[PDB]
Design a protein around this ligand. Structure first.
Ligand code: A1AJX
Length: 164
């Protein structure tokens, strides 16, 4: 049910859209969250997805951390998608503003290969501080399953396409 995407490769598609609005429209099997290790969904993609769930994502996430402890940078966990998707795959890309290793970005994108099709944002981009052009290149060179990327900023979308 994905519509209006530009094909980049055999398996990677892109659209200028808010991932929350795309998830509400499509109700995909898997929506990816740009999470941190504590699953504290304050801003960016995570804060916007959590707000759209009426804070249910945060309540579930707090129970997950109380039981399991924090995720690893480069790691993931599968939780409910609430009203947005069947599942949410919470993936932790490195936060360059905190000195985390950018080489962990490839490990973060490898989590996508466990799912046949995903709606996702660019990992480590936006408020996580990494170069979005680099994040798109690692995505295309790492993910083998079908990924539909939603990029909120129109100016950045146009730059990603024109430099691909
Ligand atoms: C990861 C970033 C490059 C990107 N953020 C996002 N991209 C897609 N849906 C989103 N909802 C809330 C944030 C958000 C951006 N700022 O264009």
């Amino acid at each position: 049910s994905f519509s209006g995407y530009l094909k980049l490769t055999d398996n990677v598609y892109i659209k200028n859209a808010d991932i929350v609005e795309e998830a509400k429209k499509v109700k995909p099997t898997v929506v990816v969250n740009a999470a941190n290790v504590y699953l504290k969904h304050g801003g960016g993609v995570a804060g916007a997805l959590n707000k759209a769930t009426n804070n249910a994502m945060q309540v579930e996430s707090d129970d997950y951390i109380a039981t399991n402890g924090p995720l690893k940078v480069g790691g993931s966990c599968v939780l409910s998608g609430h009203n947005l998707a069947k599942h949410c795959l919470h993936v932790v890309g490195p936060n360059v503003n905190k000195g985390e290793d950018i080489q962990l970005l490839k490990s973060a994108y490898e989590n996508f290969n466990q799912h046949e099709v995903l709606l996702a944002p660019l990992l480590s981009a936006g408020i996580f501080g990494a170069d979005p052009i680099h994040s798109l290149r690692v995505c295309v060179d790492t993910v083998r399953t079908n990924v539909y990327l939603a990029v909120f900023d129109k100016n950045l979308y146009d730059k990603l396409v024109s430099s691909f």
